[PDB]
PDB file of C-alpha atoms in Angstrom:
ATOM      1  CA  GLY A   1     -18.395  33.447  -5.893  1.00 57.46           C
ATOM      2  CA  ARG A   2     -17.015  30.229  -7.278  1.00 57.03           C
ATOM      3  CA  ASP A   3     -16.937  26.603  -6.197  1.00 57.00           C
ATOM      4  CA  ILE A   4     -14.126  24.060  -6.796  1.00 58.63           C
ATOM      5  CA  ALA A   5     -15.430  23.105 -10.242  1.00 59.07           C
ATOM      6  CA  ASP A   6     -16.201  26.594 -11.716  1.00 59.45           C
ATOM      7  CA  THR A   7     -19.732  26.700 -10.313  1.00 62.30           C
ATOM      8  CA  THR A   8     -21.471  29.910  -9.271  1.00 62.62           C
ATOM      9  CA  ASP A   9     -22.068  28.968  -5.637  1.00 64.76           C
ATOM     10  CA  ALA A  10     -22.628  32.491  -4.317  1.00 64.31           C
ATOM     11  CA  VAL A  11     -23.682  35.858  -5.718  1.00 64.26           C
ATOM     12  CA  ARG A  12     -23.674  39.320  -4.170  1.00 65.81           C
ATOM     13  CA  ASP A  13     -26.768  41.460  -4.557  1.00 64.86           C
ATOM     14  CA  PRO A  14     -26.107  44.679  -6.518  1.00 65.79           C
ATOM     15  CA  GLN A  15     -28.648  46.923  -4.777  1.00 65.65           C
ATOM     16  CA  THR A  16     -27.551  45.911  -1.276  1.00 66.26           C
ATOM     17  CA  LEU A  17     -24.161  44.300  -0.747  1.00 65.55           C
ATOM     18  CA  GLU A  18     -25.236  41.046   0.914  1.00 65.96           C
ATOM     19  CA  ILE A  19     -23.701  37.637   0.259  1.00 67.13           C
ATOM     20  CA  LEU A  20     -26.256  35.065  -0.889  1.00 67.53           C
ATOM     21  CA  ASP A  21     -25.511  31.369  -1.229  1.00 69.44           C
ATOM     22  CA  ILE A  22     -27.105  29.574  -4.166  1.00 70.48           C
ATOM     23  CA  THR A  23     -28.289  26.192  -3.013  1.00 71.21           C
ATOM     24  CA  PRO A  24     -29.499  24.573  -6.269  1.00 72.74           C
ATOM     25  CA  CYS A  25     -33.170  23.743  -6.713  1.00 72.15           C
ATOM     26  CA  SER A  26     -33.626  20.311  -5.212  1.00 71.02           C
ATOM     27  CA  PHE A  27     -34.134  17.479  -7.669  1.00 66.96           C
ATOM     28  CA  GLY A  28     -33.635  13.744  -7.891  1.00 66.04           C
ATOM     29  CA  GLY A  29     -34.494  10.623  -9.806  1.00 66.77           C
ATOM     30  CA  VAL A  30     -37.820   8.889  -9.248  1.00 67.09           C
ATOM     31  CA  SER A  31     -37.609   5.138  -8.665  1.00 65.07           C
ATOM     32  CA  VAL A  32     -40.388   2.574  -8.232  1.00 66.12           C
ATOM     33  CA  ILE A  33     -40.072  -0.179  -5.635  1.00 65.79           C
ATOM     34  CA  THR A  34     -42.442  -2.957  -6.646  1.00 65.41           C
ATOM     35  CA  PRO A  35     -42.718  -6.731  -6.715  1.00 65.17           C
ATOM     36  CA  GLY A  36     -43.999  -8.519  -9.800  1.00 67.30           C
ATOM     37  CA  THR A  37     -47.202  -7.585 -11.630  1.00 64.67           C
ATOM     38  CA  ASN A  38     -48.039 -11.287 -11.492  1.00 64.06           C
ATOM     39  CA  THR A  39     -48.048 -10.915  -7.702  1.00 64.26           C
ATOM     40  CA  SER A  40     -49.620  -7.490  -7.111  1.00 63.72           C
ATOM     41  CA  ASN A  41     -49.913  -3.950  -8.428  1.00 64.70           C
ATOM     42  CA  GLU A  42     -49.097  -2.059  -5.226  1.00 65.23           C
ATOM     43  CA  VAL A  43     -46.053   0.191  -5.688  1.00 67.08           C
ATOM     44  CA  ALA A  44     -43.763   2.179  -3.377  1.00 65.63           C
ATOM     45  CA  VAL A  45     -41.979   5.273  -4.670  1.00 65.82           C
ATOM     46  CA  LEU A  46     -38.478   6.138  -3.457  1.00 65.34           C
ATOM     47  CA  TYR A  47     -37.533   9.776  -4.061  1.00 67.07           C
ATOM     48  CA  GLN A  48     -33.776  10.247  -4.133  1.00 68.50           C
ATOM     49  CA  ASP A  49     -31.659  13.321  -3.300  1.00 68.74           C
TER      50      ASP A  49
ATOM     51  CA  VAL B   1       7.249 -27.250  18.010  1.00 66.93           C
ATOM     52  CA  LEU B   2       4.145 -25.212  18.784  1.00 68.68           C
ATOM     53  CA  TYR B   3       3.543 -26.744  22.183  1.00 67.50           C
ATOM     54  CA  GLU B   4       7.093 -26.258  23.413  1.00 68.68           C
ATOM     55  CA  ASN B   5       7.418 -22.690  22.078  1.00 71.01           C
ATOM     56  CA  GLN B   6       4.058 -20.880  22.147  1.00 69.08           C
ATOM     57  CA  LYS B   7       4.719 -17.832  24.348  1.00 67.59           C
ATOM     58  CA  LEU B   8       7.430 -16.526  22.038  1.00 66.62           C
ATOM     59  CA  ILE B   9       4.887 -16.894  19.222  1.00 66.81           C
ATOM     60  CA  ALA B  10       2.501 -14.833  21.383  1.00 67.57           C
ATOM     61  CA  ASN B  11       5.028 -12.030  21.869  1.00 67.50           C
ATOM     62  CA  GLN B  12       6.039 -12.079  18.183  1.00 66.39           C
ATOM     63  CA  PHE B  13       2.409 -11.988  17.067  1.00 67.24           C
ATOM     64  CA  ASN B  14       1.380  -9.170  19.414  1.00 69.89           C
ATOM     65  CA  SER B  15       4.535  -7.188  18.607  1.00 71.04           C
ATOM     66  CA  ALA B  16       3.860  -7.689  14.905  1.00 67.88           C
ATOM     67  CA  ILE B  17       0.282  -6.413  15.294  1.00 68.64           C
ATOM     68  CA  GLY B  18       1.703  -3.433  17.181  1.00 66.17           C
ATOM     69  CA  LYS B  19       4.167  -2.973  14.326  1.00 63.64           C
ATOM     70  CA  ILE B  20       1.239  -2.859  11.874  1.00 63.52           C
ATOM     71  CA  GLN B  21      -0.646  -0.318  13.981  1.00 63.95           C
ATOM     72  CA  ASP B  22       2.532   1.761  14.228  1.00 65.82           C
ATOM     73  CA  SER B  23       2.979   1.490  10.453  1.00 66.12           C
ATOM     74  CA  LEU B  24      -0.580   2.672   9.854  1.00 63.21           C
ATOM     75  CA  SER B  25      -0.122   5.403  12.463  1.00 60.30           C
ATOM     76  CA  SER B  26       3.129   6.598  10.895  1.00 61.94           C
ATOM     77  CA  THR B  27       2.263   6.846   7.195  1.00 59.28           C
ATOM     78  CA  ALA B  28      -0.883   7.248   5.110  1.00 60.61           C
ATOM     79  CA  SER B  29       0.875   5.929   1.988  1.00 58.33           C
ATOM     80  CA  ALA B  30      -0.230   2.339   2.655  1.00 58.27           C
ATOM     81  CA  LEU B  31      -3.745   3.241   1.465  1.00 60.64           C
ATOM     82  CA  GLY B  32      -2.510   4.811  -1.757  1.00 59.63           C
ATOM     83  CA  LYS B  33      -4.502   2.444  -3.974  1.00 59.76           C
ATOM     84  CA  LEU B  34      -7.780   3.373  -2.271  1.00 58.92           C
ATOM     85  CA  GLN B  35      -6.871   7.062  -2.310  1.00 58.79           C
ATOM     86  CA  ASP B  36      -5.918   6.666  -5.976  1.00 59.79           C
ATOM     87  CA  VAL B  37      -9.331   5.151  -6.758  1.00 62.67           C
ATOM     88  CA  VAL B  38     -11.152   7.955  -4.915  1.00 62.10           C
ATOM     89  CA  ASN B  39      -8.943  10.587  -6.563  1.00 62.37           C
ATOM     90  CA  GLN B  40      -9.585   8.962  -9.953  1.00 60.15           C
ATOM     91  CA  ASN B  41     -13.358   9.109  -9.492  1.00 63.58           C
ATOM     92  CA  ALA B  42     -13.309  12.685  -8.180  1.00 62.35           C
ATOM     93  CA  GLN B  43     -10.895  13.626 -10.962  1.00 60.42           C
ATOM     94  CA  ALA B  44     -13.212  12.177 -13.614  1.00 59.70           C
ATOM     95  CA  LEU B  45     -16.197  13.973 -12.077  1.00 58.40           C
ATOM     96  CA  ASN B  46     -14.379  17.317 -11.885  1.00 60.66           C
ATOM     97  CA  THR B  47     -13.127  16.716 -15.430  1.00 61.09           C
ATOM     98  CA  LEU B  48     -16.763  16.244 -16.454  1.00 59.62           C
ATOM     99  CA  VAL B  49     -17.710  19.577 -14.868  1.00 58.60           C
TER     100      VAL B  49
END
């Protein structure tokens, strides 16, 4: 298959003709929500996407 | 001039607001700047892919 921007969104299995979507492996940037180190050292992590 | 002629101002104002809602209902070309911005961003992203 193909997506709008030339991306392999779907493949068909050669041994058995089934249509398989390729959701990409989920990934995202790691951000740290913290106040100042003068105030505390407790952190909160926001995982995006 | 207001206080002798306010009801005609009321009808003109309500009819003008109805004219705006008819203008937005009739065409989607009023929002062409916003659609141009969104198309520019999606165009740059697809160009990147």
